[PDB]
Structure formats: C-alpha cells, structure tokens
Amino acid sequence: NEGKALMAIKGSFSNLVNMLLDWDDVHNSDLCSWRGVFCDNVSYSVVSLNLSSLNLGGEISPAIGDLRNLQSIDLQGNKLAGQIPDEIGNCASLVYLDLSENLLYGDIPFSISKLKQLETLNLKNNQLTGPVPATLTQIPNLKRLDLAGNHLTGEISRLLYWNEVLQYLGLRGNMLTGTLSSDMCQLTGLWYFDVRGNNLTGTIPESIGNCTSFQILDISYNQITGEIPYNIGFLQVATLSLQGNRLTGRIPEVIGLMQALAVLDLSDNELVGPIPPILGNLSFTGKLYLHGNMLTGPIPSELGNMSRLSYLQLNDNKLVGTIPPELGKLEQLFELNLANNRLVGPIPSNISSCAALNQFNVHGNLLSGSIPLAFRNLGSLTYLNLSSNNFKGKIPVELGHIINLDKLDLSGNNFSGSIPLTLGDLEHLLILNLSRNHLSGQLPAEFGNLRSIQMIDVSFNLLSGVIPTELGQLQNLNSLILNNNKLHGKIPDQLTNCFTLVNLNVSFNNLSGIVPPMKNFSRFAPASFVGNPYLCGNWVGSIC
Amino acid sequence: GARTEPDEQDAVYDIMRATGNDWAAAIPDVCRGRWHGIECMPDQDNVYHVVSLSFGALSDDTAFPTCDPQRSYVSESLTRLKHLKALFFYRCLGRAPQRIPAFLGRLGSSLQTLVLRENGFLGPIPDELGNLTNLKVLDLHKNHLNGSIPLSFNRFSGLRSLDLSGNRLTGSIPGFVLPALSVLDLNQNLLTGPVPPTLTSCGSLIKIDLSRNRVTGPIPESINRLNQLVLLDLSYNRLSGPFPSSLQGLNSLQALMLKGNTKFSTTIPENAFKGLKNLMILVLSNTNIQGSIPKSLTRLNSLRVLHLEGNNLTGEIPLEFRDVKHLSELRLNDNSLTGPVPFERDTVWRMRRKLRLYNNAGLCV
C-alpha cells in the first residue's frame, strides 16, 4: 500500500539508472530502510522523504499524496519537471516542503493551503508562473516562504503582510508588479524581507520605521521612486539594500544612528547632495556601497572612523577634493573603489596602513603627484587601477614586489623614466596596461617571465629599442599592443610561438623588415602595421 | 543616566518569576538590561516605561523567553504595567487548565496588541477584554475557548485584526460595526446563525475567513459594499442559495471559496460573476450547484483556478472554454455534463492532470 506509492514515485522519475536500486517492493521487504525514506518507529509509516541532489529527472508523481503521514519532503536538485501535483495537499501532517532547484512549472497549487501544519514552503529556483495567491495567508504556522528564482506575476496583495509568525519572505527574482504597502510593517515576526529583482513601482512607505523586527531589508533593483523616508532610521536592520532603484533626494542623516547596520547599499540610484559625515559613527558596518549616484563634496574623513569597514565603493559619483589620509585608519579595508570622480591631489601615503587592502581603483579622477613608496607595503594588493589620471614620476621598482598583482593599469597618466625590470617578475599578472604615458627606454625583455600574462599594452609612449624577442615565451598572451612608440628593428619571428596571440598592434613605430608567418595573421586589424616607414608588407603606406 | 520606573520593574520581576524565568529578578535595570521580548521607552522625564512584553518561542534570529510547563502562569502583576502597548504569549503552556484572565481588562487604554496564540486557554472569553478600548490586533488562535464571542467586542472601535480561529466558539456571530477592521478570521469554530448584516458595513475588510463553522442562510446581496475585500472563504458551512444577482462591487476579490456547503442548491446565473476584474481563485465544489456552466466564467481575465467538481452540473461545456489559455486548474469532474469536450490540444497538453473531466458520462471525444 505504501510501497505501492513509493514505487509510483520511483516510476515517475527518469534517470534512475543505478539510483534507487534499493526501491524494490519484492526483493527488498523493508520499505523503511530504502534510500532516503524515514519511518517512525511505532507505525512504520513514511514520515520523511529526502532524495536531495540525485538528479532523478522525472516528475513528482501524485502518489506522493498517498503517504498521508509525511512530515517532511525534500526533492531538491533533481531536474524535476511537470507541475506541483495537487495531491501534496492531502499530506495533512506535512511540516517541511522543499522543491527548490528543479524545473517545476505552473501555479502554486491551491491544495498547498490545506497544509495546516506547514512551516517551510521552499520553491526556490523553478519555472513556476502565476500569482502569489492569497491562499498562502491561510497557512497558520508558515514561518518560511521562499519563492525566489521563478517567474511569478501580479502584485503583492497586502493581505500577505498580515502575519505574525512569518520569518522569511523571499520573493527575489520574479516579475512582481505593483507597490509596497504600509501594512508591510504588520509582518511583526519577520526578520528577512527580500523582494529584489522584481518590477515594483511606488515609493518606500513612510511608516517603514514600524518594521523594527527586520534584520535584512532588501528591495533593490526594482524601479522604486521617491525619497528615502526619515523613519528608515528606526529600522534595526543589519542589511539595508536599496540599490538599483530610482531613489531621489539626499541621504537621510538619521541613517548615521543605525549602529546595528552591517551592510548599507544605496548605490545605482539618483541620489544627490553630500555624503553625510555622521556615517562615521557606523562603527559596525563592513560594506558601504554609495556608487553610481550624483553625490557631491568630499570623501568625509569620518569614513576613517568606521573601524570594521572592509568594502568601500564610492565610484561613479561627483565627489571632489582630496582622498582623506584618515582612510589609513581602516586597517581591515579590503576593497577601495573611488573611480570616476573629480578627486584631487596625491594618493595619501597613510593609505599604506590598510595592510589587508586587496583592490585599489582610483580610475578617472584628477589625482596628482607620484605613487608614494609606501605602496610597497600593500602586500595583499591584487587589483591596481590608477588609470586615467595626472600622476607623474617613474613607475617604482618596488611596484614589482607586490607578488599577488594580477591586474595593473597605470594607463592615461604622465609617468616618466623606463619600465622597471621587476614588472617582469609579477608571476600571476594577467593584465598589464601601461599605455598613454611618457615612458622611455627599452621594452623590457624580462616581460618574458610573465608566465600568466594575457594582455600587454604599452602604446602611446616613447619606448625605444627593439621588440623583445622573449615575448614568444608568453603562452597566454592574446593581446600585444605596442603602437605609437619609437621601437625599431624587425618583428621577432618568435612571436609565432604565442599560441594564443589574436590581436597585435605595432603600428606607428620605426620597425623595419617583413612580418613573420603568424598563425593568426587574419585575426589582426588592417592597420596593424601602418606607419612603419621601412616595414615591407601588402598595405598602403609601406614601401612594398 | 536614565533608570526604569521601580514599580514597573518589580512588576516585570514578578511577571517573569510567574512565567518560570526567575532570572529576570536579578537584573539591576530591566529596561537598560533589556532582553529580547521586553521593550522600554522613556517619557520626557528620563524615566523608562515597559511598553512591550513577549513570551514563547516565536523565534527569529533570537527567541523570546519560554515558559516552564510545570510552573508558569499569567500573573495579575501585568496590571502594574500602566503603559503596556503590546503583549505576546506564543505556545506558552501552563501546567493544567487555565482561563484567559479577566484582569487583562485592567490595563485598558495603553494596550493595542494582545496576542495569546496557542496557549491552551480554556473556558469562555472574558467579557472585560472589552475594556481594551484601543486594541488594534487581537489574536486568540487555536485555544480551547468555550461559549460565545463576547458582545463587548463592540468597543474595539479601532480594531484592525481579529483572529479567533481554531477554538470551540458557539452562538451566532455578533454584529459589530468595526470601521477599520481589515482581517476577520473566525474559521474552525462552532458558530451558527446567518451571516451578520453588519458584516457588510466593515468596509476596510480585506479578508473574511468563516470556513468550517455552522453558518446558515444566504450570502447577503450587500457584500458588494466590501470594495476592498481580497479573500472570502465560506467553505464548509450550511449556506444556501441563491448567489446575489450581482457581485460587481467586489473588486480586489482574488479568491472566493464556498466548498462543502452541501445544500447550497442554486444555479449560477450568467450575470452573477461578471465584473470581477481580479478574481483568480473560484472554488464552488461539492455544493449541489444546479444548471449549466455559465460561459461568463470564460471572460474572467485573472482567473487561474476554477473548481466545480462534485455538483449536479448538466449540459454542454461552453465552447468558449476553447479560448481560455490562462487556467492552471480546472475541475469539472463528478457532474453530469454531456457535450463534447471543447479544449484544444494546446491547453490539454499544458494542463495535463490539472484538468479534471472524469465521471461525466455524457462527455464525448
């Protein structure tokens, strides 16, 4: 009788090659010891079925409704298709239902509302379509409602928000329209509110400060308009995720009193005005994402009072002034992105006290002076984008002693001197863009030691000498851009051993000779070699 | 330099001692040593007052204090908390039979939230719960409550949410006119009599759950006044026909369930369900509905779920159903329909088992 149902559930799968060989109603007498089934030790009836992560690949048989004493179902990660069968609704004792990570389609069945004992409804990441029905408000014990990763439609009826026992409202990534409601703060027991990635218009309700039980508020990427209400300051959230919307106005200063905050993301909106300095006393936040707005004024030096700040993104704004030296108090700063602003002055030396600093990006500003020497102390540095600025001086020798550098962009500046040979021993370097400067001397042959390198750009400089012949050793180099220099001599024959060299631009030099047989000569641009007087090829502007 | 009001603090000590958590008696200041489950707020005079008090494993990241099943009880010292705004007890079970204490009325004007959910309370609801004049949320779900719903609930003028589900309440539903009432949940009780007429005068109602009771009579033709009503569940009662001639004033209605009113015994006029712009769920199964499936159901735009199984429906399935491509569940099984089934391979192969037509001897092809 129960083995009947278990056998139908097995038979409704597909890819069960050597999978449920346990399940054999006649060669395996005890159905209470088959793979993934659990009975209670008194009636020996199925109460819990966990076939997680087996890729059984079929459908969910209606016979699952014939295990009346089921308390837990876990069919996650099995490439299951079809609709959620109505018969799950007559699993009256069901307490936990997890169908996440499958390919189930259709509506959330009406029979789901018959499960008066249900506490966890996890339907994450399927192809479910249709509305979030009001019937889910008829589940008196539901604590976890995770419907993320589907194609659900319609509005979030405010009927849903009248619930005292709900803990987790996960609706991320659907196509939900309409608005938030003020009744949102009636979710008096909720700790997680996630509606990111939908299409909800309207504004943030002004009474949202009544939602004091929330631990994570996430309404990001949603097309929400209006301003940030003052009462946002009464939230006790640790995560406030408002990014990717159409918010206007200034940043409410009251956000500076939310000391329980750990992640503050106001980015990719249309905010204006200054960065409120009160943000300094946010001594427990580790992520401050204010990028992609129209902010104005300085990087407040009080940002250095954020002891636990680790990820600071202020890029794509309109900030002015200097980089505050007090940023060097952030001993735990991991990533610093000040790109695309109007900052001014030197890179502060004190920023070498951010020992754990891992990515540093000041691209697109008006910074001045030289790279301070204390940057050699940034041992953990990995991404270094000083591009498009007004730096001067020579590329420091010590820059080569940052062993973990994999992306180095000094382009678009006014660097002088010759390239340090230590740049050649950046073992893990993948991208090296030194173009658009005043670099002189020879192109270093030590660049041959760049084991991992894939892109080398040193165009628009004053480089002289010869194209280093050791570049042929570079087995991952796919882009070699040397144009607009004063390199002379012949294009090395060893460049043919660059197994992956797809793009090469050595035009506008003093190169002579012919081009050697390249195994990817046709993938090059037409003007790859123009502007070399004594270079002999089959193009206009050559003597041949 | 702020401190908690001393009598409110000693009252907190005694409440906690009565609930099984004698440890709270040791905190020098409960309002500044605030635990999860207690909330204080200061007046202009820099003195803290207790405002919220919660018990039971409602959980979250954090959990509230639980109650020792051998010792706990609700202490009268709650009346010493003059400023209490919210009181939570969730699954906080005592040793033995305990009634809802009448002294809860003695903290009247301050209280706005009274939640006594699943606590095993017995006997009748105390009448003096009507003293809680500013109550906006009242939750007495799944207890064992004797007798009638108190008439003094008339005094909850500001009530937003009333939940008395899962008890043994008897008598007819008293007819309060609560102008701000949003959710009314009285399902799974033993209520009788007709649908109160005054029900249709609480216009803020978005949810009416009267399912699993003994309510008799017809659906009043004045439900059209509930222009904000989202969910109307009248399943498993003793309701009777007919439908109101017109249901057009019920926009925002997403779900209407009348399943199991086994002596409803009327027909569905073509004119009945026209105009329901947001109707998604319509369950009319096992109600002895007579006549022919109105084709107007075809033109309901938001309709996803249509349940008509277990009735005395007869005749042709409207051919206009051929043109319906948004139904996810449609049950017509166990009637005496008679024509040829008019569904396209298109939607037959999409719906599969979620389209039920069996046990109609008449049906063809």
PDB file of C-alpha atoms in Angstrom, chain B residues 58-266:
ATOM      1  CA  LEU B  58       8.200  32.610  18.080  1.00  0.00           C
ATOM      2  CA  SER B  59      11.895  32.559  17.074  1.00  0.00           C
ATOM      3  CA  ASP B  60      13.643  34.831  14.534  1.00  0.00           C
ATOM      4  CA  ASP B  61      17.363  35.099  14.778  1.00  0.00           C
ATOM      5  CA  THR B  62      16.661  35.428  18.529  1.00  0.00           C
ATOM      6  CA  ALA B  63      13.916  33.792  20.598  1.00  0.00           C
ATOM      7  CA  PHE B  64      11.724  35.127  23.384  1.00  0.00           C
ATOM      8  CA  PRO B  65      11.679  33.677  26.905  1.00  0.00           C
ATOM      9  CA  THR B  66       9.805  30.385  27.115  1.00  0.00           C
ATOM     10  CA  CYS B  67       7.576  29.261  29.965  1.00  0.00           C
ATOM     11  CA  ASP B  68       8.328  26.340  32.271  1.00  0.00           C
ATOM     12  CA  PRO B  69       5.460  23.872  31.659  1.00  0.00           C
ATOM     13  CA  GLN B  70       5.415  22.937  35.364  1.00  0.00           C
ATOM     14  CA  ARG B  71       5.294  26.400  36.939  1.00  0.00           C
ATOM     15  CA  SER B  72       4.180  29.130  34.562  1.00  0.00           C
ATOM     16  CA  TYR B  73       1.028  31.239  34.645  1.00  0.00           C
ATOM     17  CA  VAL B  74      -0.064  34.717  33.605  1.00  0.00           C
ATOM     18  CA  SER B  75       0.440  36.932  36.650  1.00  0.00           C
ATOM     19  CA  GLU B  76      -2.004  39.656  37.670  1.00  0.00           C
ATOM     20  CA  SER B  77       1.041  41.907  38.166  1.00  0.00           C
ATOM     21  CA  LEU B  78       0.652  42.766  34.470  1.00  0.00           C
ATOM     22  CA  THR B  79      -1.874  45.330  35.717  1.00  0.00           C
ATOM     23  CA  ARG B  80       1.001  47.244  37.339  1.00  0.00           C
ATOM     24  CA  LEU B  81       2.445  47.974  33.870  1.00  0.00           C
ATOM     25  CA  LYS B  82       0.441  51.121  33.216  1.00  0.00           C
ATOM     26  CA  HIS B  83       1.958  51.806  29.776  1.00  0.00           C
ATOM     27  CA  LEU B  84       1.953  48.314  28.208  1.00  0.00           C
ATOM     28  CA  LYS B  85       1.327  48.645  24.468  1.00  0.00           C
ATOM     29  CA  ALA B  86       1.837  45.043  23.294  1.00  0.00           C
ATOM     30  CA  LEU B  87       1.596  41.632  24.975  1.00  0.00           C
ATOM     31  CA  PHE B  88       2.712  38.382  23.305  1.00  0.00           C
ATOM     32  CA  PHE B  89       2.276  34.820  24.553  1.00  0.00           C
ATOM     33  CA  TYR B  90       3.035  32.176  21.919  1.00  0.00           C
ATOM     34  CA  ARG B  91       2.778  28.469  22.772  1.00  0.00           C
ATOM     35  CA  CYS B  92       3.440  29.320  26.433  1.00  0.00           C
ATOM     36  CA  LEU B  93       1.669  26.402  28.094  1.00  0.00           C
ATOM     37  CA  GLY B  94       0.942  26.158  31.796  1.00  0.00           C
ATOM     38  CA  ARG B  95       0.685  23.014  33.871  1.00  0.00           C
ATOM     39  CA  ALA B  96      -3.046  22.483  33.709  1.00  0.00           C
ATOM     40  CA  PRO B  97      -6.381  24.154  32.780  1.00  0.00           C
ATOM     41  CA  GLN B  98      -6.104  27.940  32.703  1.00  0.00           C
ATOM     42  CA  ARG B  99      -8.623  30.518  31.520  1.00  0.00           C
ATOM     43  CA  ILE B 100      -7.972  33.857  29.878  1.00  0.00           C
ATOM     44  CA  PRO B 101      -7.501  36.052  32.967  1.00  0.00           C
ATOM     45  CA  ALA B 102     -10.092  38.784  33.384  1.00  0.00           C
ATOM     46  CA  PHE B 103      -7.569  41.206  34.886  1.00  0.00           C
ATOM     47  CA  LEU B 104      -6.247  41.767  31.353  1.00  0.00           C
ATOM     48  CA  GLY B 105      -9.040  44.326  31.064  1.00  0.00           C
ATOM     49  CA  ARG B 106      -7.447  46.422  33.841  1.00  0.00           C
ATOM     50  CA  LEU B 107      -4.712  47.759  31.531  1.00  0.00           C
ATOM     51  CA  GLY B 108      -7.180  49.349  29.143  1.00  0.00           C
ATOM     52  CA  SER B 109      -6.194  52.403  27.121  1.00  0.00           C
ATOM     53  CA  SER B 110      -2.497  51.605  26.628  1.00  0.00           C
ATOM     54  CA  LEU B 111      -2.829  48.118  25.124  1.00  0.00           C
ATOM     55  CA  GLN B 112      -3.025  47.964  21.332  1.00  0.00           C
ATOM     56  CA  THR B 113      -1.804  44.398  20.656  1.00  0.00           C
ATOM     57  CA  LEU B 114      -2.983  41.344  22.590  1.00  0.00           C
ATOM     58  CA  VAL B 115      -1.671  38.053  21.199  1.00  0.00           C
ATOM     59  CA  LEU B 116      -2.442  34.878  23.170  1.00  0.00           C
ATOM     60  CA  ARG B 117      -1.692  32.337  20.443  1.00  0.00           C
ATOM     61  CA  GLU B 118      -1.824  28.560  21.027  1.00  0.00           C
ATOM     62  CA  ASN B 119      -1.601  28.661  24.828  1.00  0.00           C
ATOM     63  CA  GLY B 120      -4.191  26.039  25.774  1.00  0.00           C
ATOM     64  CA  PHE B 121      -6.570  28.579  27.323  1.00  0.00           C
ATOM     65  CA  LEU B 122      -9.962  27.182  28.381  1.00  0.00           C
ATOM     66  CA  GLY B 123     -13.435  28.425  29.170  1.00  0.00           C
ATOM     67  CA  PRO B 124     -15.244  31.482  27.873  1.00  0.00           C
ATOM     68  CA  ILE B 125     -13.590  34.633  26.622  1.00  0.00           C
ATOM     69  CA  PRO B 126     -13.707  37.166  29.489  1.00  0.00           C
ATOM     70  CA  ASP B 127     -16.182  39.960  28.860  1.00  0.00           C
ATOM     71  CA  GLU B 128     -13.817  42.550  30.353  1.00  0.00           C
ATOM     72  CA  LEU B 129     -11.450  42.070  27.427  1.00  0.00           C
ATOM     73  CA  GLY B 130     -13.795  44.744  26.065  1.00  0.00           C
ATOM     74  CA  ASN B 131     -12.062  47.294  28.303  1.00  0.00           C
ATOM     75  CA  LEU B 132      -9.026  47.147  25.968  1.00  0.00           C
ATOM     76  CA  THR B 133     -10.512  50.021  24.006  1.00  0.00           C
ATOM     77  CA  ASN B 134      -7.545  50.864  21.768  1.00  0.00           C
ATOM     78  CA  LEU B 135      -6.889  47.238  20.782  1.00  0.00           C
ATOM     79  CA  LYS B 136      -5.872  47.038  17.129  1.00  0.00           C
ATOM     80  CA  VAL B 137      -4.696  43.398  16.939  1.00  0.00           C
ATOM     81  CA  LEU B 138      -6.405  40.628  18.913  1.00  0.00           C
ATOM     82  CA  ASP B 139      -5.187  37.067  18.372  1.00  0.00           C
ATOM     83  CA  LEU B 140      -6.736  34.130  20.252  1.00  0.00           C
ATOM     84  CA  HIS B 141      -5.901  31.498  17.636  1.00  0.00           C
ATOM     85  CA  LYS B 142      -6.022  27.755  18.407  1.00  0.00           C
ATOM     86  CA  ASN B 143      -7.012  27.682  22.060  1.00  0.00           C
ATOM     87  CA  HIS B 144      -9.953  25.754  23.570  1.00  0.00           C
ATOM     88  CA  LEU B 145     -12.402  28.594  24.159  1.00  0.00           C
ATOM     89  CA  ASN B 146     -15.881  27.789  25.498  1.00  0.00           C
ATOM     90  CA  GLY B 147     -19.077  29.613  24.775  1.00  0.00           C
ATOM     91  CA  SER B 148     -19.910  32.731  22.804  1.00  0.00           C
ATOM     92  CA  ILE B 149     -17.953  35.639  21.372  1.00  0.00           C
ATOM     93  CA  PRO B 150     -18.378  38.493  23.891  1.00  0.00           C
ATOM     94  CA  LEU B 151     -20.646  41.309  22.765  1.00  0.00           C
ATOM     95  CA  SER B 152     -18.314  43.836  24.434  1.00  0.00           C
ATOM     96  CA  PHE B 153     -16.034  43.383  21.411  1.00  0.00           C
ATOM     97  CA  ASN B 154     -18.319  46.144  20.112  1.00  0.00           C
ATOM     98  CA  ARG B 155     -15.975  48.534  21.957  1.00  0.00           C
ATOM     99  CA  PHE B 156     -12.905  47.751  19.770  1.00  0.00           C
ATOM    100  CA  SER B 157     -13.584  50.768  17.574  1.00  0.00           C
ATOM    101  CA  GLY B 158     -10.008  50.926  16.263  1.00  0.00           C
ATOM    102  CA  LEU B 159      -9.560  47.173  15.779  1.00  0.00           C
ATOM    103  CA  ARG B 160      -7.511  46.273  12.699  1.00  0.00           C
ATOM    104  CA  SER B 161      -7.222  42.474  13.032  1.00  0.00           C
ATOM    105  CA  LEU B 162      -9.432  39.922  14.805  1.00  0.00           C
ATOM    106  CA  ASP B 163      -8.279  36.281  14.871  1.00  0.00           C
ATOM    107  CA  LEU B 164     -10.330  33.784  16.915  1.00  0.00           C
ATOM    108  CA  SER B 165      -9.559  30.787  14.698  1.00  0.00           C
ATOM    109  CA  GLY B 166      -9.382  27.202  15.893  1.00  0.00           C
ATOM    110  CA  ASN B 167     -11.498  27.288  19.056  1.00  0.00           C
ATOM    111  CA  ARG B 168     -14.923  25.987  20.118  1.00  0.00           C
ATOM    112  CA  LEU B 169     -16.840  29.266  19.988  1.00  0.00           C
ATOM    113  CA  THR B 170     -20.621  28.913  19.743  1.00  0.00           C
ATOM    114  CA  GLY B 171     -23.621  31.131  19.133  1.00  0.00           C
ATOM    115  CA  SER B 172     -24.191  33.452  16.224  1.00  0.00           C
ATOM    116  CA  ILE B 173     -21.501  35.857  15.039  1.00  0.00           C
ATOM    117  CA  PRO B 174     -22.250  39.100  16.919  1.00  0.00           C
ATOM    118  CA  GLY B 175     -22.769  42.036  14.616  1.00  0.00           C
ATOM    119  CA  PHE B 176     -20.182  44.677  15.404  1.00  0.00           C
ATOM    120  CA  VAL B 177     -19.594  47.553  13.004  1.00  0.00           C
ATOM    121  CA  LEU B 178     -15.813  47.959  13.116  1.00  0.00           C
ATOM    122  CA  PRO B 179     -14.903  50.642  10.551  1.00  0.00           C
ATOM    123  CA  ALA B 180     -11.125  49.999  10.464  1.00  0.00           C
ATOM    124  CA  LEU B 181     -11.288  46.194  10.625  1.00  0.00           C
ATOM    125  CA  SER B 182      -9.067  44.625   7.953  1.00  0.00           C
ATOM    126  CA  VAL B 183      -8.915  40.870   8.723  1.00  0.00           C
ATOM    127  CA  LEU B 184     -11.708  38.841  10.337  1.00  0.00           C
ATOM    128  CA  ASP B 185     -10.717  35.212  10.943  1.00  0.00           C
ATOM    129  CA  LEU B 186     -13.241  33.027  12.793  1.00  0.00           C
ATOM    130  CA  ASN B 187     -12.626  29.783  10.919  1.00  0.00           C
ATOM    131  CA  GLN B 188     -12.816  26.339  12.543  1.00  0.00           C
ATOM    132  CA  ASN B 189     -15.271  27.030  15.343  1.00  0.00           C
ATOM    133  CA  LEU B 190     -18.910  26.138  16.020  1.00  0.00           C
ATOM    134  CA  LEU B 191     -20.545  29.419  15.024  1.00  0.00           C
ATOM    135  CA  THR B 192     -24.140  29.390  13.799  1.00  0.00           C
ATOM    136  CA  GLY B 193     -26.869  31.689  12.526  1.00  0.00           C
ATOM    137  CA  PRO B 194     -26.849  33.806   9.384  1.00  0.00           C
ATOM    138  CA  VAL B 195     -24.106  35.996   8.028  1.00  0.00           C
ATOM    139  CA  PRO B 196     -24.472  39.119  10.200  1.00  0.00           C
ATOM    140  CA  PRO B 197     -25.776  42.002   8.087  1.00  0.00           C
ATOM    141  CA  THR B 198     -23.474  44.474   9.849  1.00  0.00           C
ATOM    142  CA  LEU B 199     -20.594  42.436   8.403  1.00  0.00           C
ATOM    143  CA  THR B 200     -21.129  44.173   5.062  1.00  0.00           C
ATOM    144  CA  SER B 201     -20.631  47.543   6.838  1.00  0.00           C
ATOM    145  CA  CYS B 202     -16.972  46.944   7.802  1.00  0.00           C
ATOM    146  CA  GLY B 203     -15.627  48.348   4.545  1.00  0.00           C
ATOM    147  CA  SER B 204     -11.920  48.069   5.371  1.00  0.00           C
ATOM    148  CA  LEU B 205     -12.156  44.260   5.342  1.00  0.00           C
ATOM    149  CA  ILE B 206      -9.650  42.556   3.050  1.00  0.00           C
ATOM    150  CA  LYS B 207     -10.030  39.022   4.498  1.00  0.00           C
ATOM    151  CA  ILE B 208     -13.136  37.221   5.760  1.00  0.00           C
ATOM    152  CA  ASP B 209     -12.464  33.633   6.855  1.00  0.00           C
ATOM    153  CA  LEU B 210     -15.607  31.962   8.208  1.00  0.00           C
ATOM    154  CA  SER B 211     -14.727  28.487   6.935  1.00  0.00           C
ATOM    155  CA  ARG B 212     -15.594  25.346   8.919  1.00  0.00           C
ATOM    156  CA  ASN B 213     -18.482  26.635  11.001  1.00  0.00           C
ATOM    157  CA  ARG B 214     -22.257  26.121  11.037  1.00  0.00           C
ATOM    158  CA  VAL B 215     -23.271  29.428   9.467  1.00  0.00           C
ATOM    159  CA  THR B 216     -26.632  29.201   7.697  1.00  0.00           C
ATOM    160  CA  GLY B 217     -28.637  31.285   5.268  1.00  0.00           C
ATOM    161  CA  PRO B 218     -27.781  33.107   2.055  1.00  0.00           C
ATOM    162  CA  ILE B 219     -24.805  35.265   1.125  1.00  0.00           C
ATOM    163  CA  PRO B 220     -26.289  38.743   1.668  1.00  0.00           C
ATOM    164  CA  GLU B 221     -26.672  40.756  -1.517  1.00  0.00           C
ATOM    165  CA  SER B 222     -24.895  43.606   0.322  1.00  0.00           C
ATOM    166  CA  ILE B 223     -21.393  42.115   0.150  1.00  0.00           C
ATOM    167  CA  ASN B 224     -20.977  44.388  -2.887  1.00  0.00           C
ATOM    168  CA  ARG B 225     -20.137  47.135  -0.365  1.00  0.00           C
ATOM    169  CA  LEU B 226     -16.848  45.387   0.520  1.00  0.00           C
ATOM    170  CA  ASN B 227     -14.885  47.094  -2.237  1.00  0.00           C
ATOM    171  CA  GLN B 228     -11.543  46.250  -0.567  1.00  0.00           C
ATOM    172  CA  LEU B 229     -12.181  42.549   0.117  1.00  0.00           C
ATOM    173  CA  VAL B 230      -9.430  40.267  -1.203  1.00  0.00           C
ATOM    174  CA  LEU B 231     -10.332  36.832   0.205  1.00  0.00           C
ATOM    175  CA  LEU B 232     -13.774  35.483   1.098  1.00  0.00           C
ATOM    176  CA  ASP B 233     -13.773  31.930   2.477  1.00  0.00           C
ATOM    177  CA  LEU B 234     -17.168  30.493   3.423  1.00  0.00           C
ATOM    178  CA  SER B 235     -16.254  26.836   2.916  1.00  0.00           C
ATOM    179  CA  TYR B 236     -17.794  24.034   4.991  1.00  0.00           C
ATOM    180  CA  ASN B 237     -20.807  25.846   6.402  1.00  0.00           C
ATOM    181  CA  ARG B 238     -24.547  25.395   5.935  1.00  0.00           C
ATOM    182  CA  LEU B 239     -25.081  28.217   3.461  1.00  0.00           C
ATOM    183  CA  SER B 240     -27.911  28.141   0.943  1.00  0.00           C
ATOM    184  CA  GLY B 241     -28.772  29.803  -2.339  1.00  0.00           C
ATOM    185  CA  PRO B 242     -29.032  31.874  -4.188  1.00  0.00           C
ATOM    186  CA  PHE B 243     -25.993  33.811  -5.267  1.00  0.00           C
ATOM    187  CA  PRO B 244     -26.519  37.571  -5.211  1.00  0.00           C
ATOM    188  CA  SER B 245     -27.825  38.660  -8.600  1.00  0.00           C
ATOM    189  CA  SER B 246     -24.734  40.858  -8.968  1.00  0.00           C
ATOM    190  CA  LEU B 247     -21.282  40.645  -7.383  1.00  0.00           C
ATOM    191  CA  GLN B 248     -19.819  43.639  -9.216  1.00  0.00           C
ATOM    192  CA  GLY B 249     -18.874  45.753  -6.207  1.00  0.00           C
ATOM    193  CA  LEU B 250     -16.297  43.140  -5.157  1.00  0.00           C
ATOM    194  CA  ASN B 251     -13.224  44.361  -6.997  1.00  0.00           C
ATOM    195  CA  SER B 252      -9.925  43.434  -5.287  1.00  0.00           C
ATOM    196  CA  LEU B 253     -11.526  39.994  -4.690  1.00  0.00           C
ATOM    197  CA  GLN B 254      -8.897  37.413  -5.639  1.00  0.00           C
ATOM    198  CA  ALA B 255     -10.326  34.281  -4.000  1.00  0.00           C
ATOM    199  CA  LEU B 256     -13.856  33.087  -3.243  1.00  0.00           C
ATOM    200  CA  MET B 257     -14.359  29.654  -1.694  1.00  0.00           C
ATOM    201  CA  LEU B 258     -17.707  28.062  -0.840  1.00  0.00           C
ATOM    202  CA  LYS B 259     -16.604  24.407  -0.936  1.00  0.00           C
ATOM    203  CA  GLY B 260     -18.639  21.931   1.086  1.00  0.00           C
ATOM    204  CA  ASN B 261     -21.842  23.933   1.599  1.00  0.00           C
ATOM    205  CA  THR B 262     -23.559  20.742   0.503  1.00  0.00           C
ATOM    206  CA  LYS B 263     -27.068  22.253   0.436  1.00  0.00           C
ATOM    207  CA  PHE B 264     -26.302  25.470  -1.443  1.00  0.00           C
ATOM    208  CA  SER B 265     -28.560  24.163  -4.225  1.00  0.00           C
ATOM    209  CA  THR B 266     -28.871  27.003  -6.721  1.00  0.00           C
TER     210      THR B 266
END
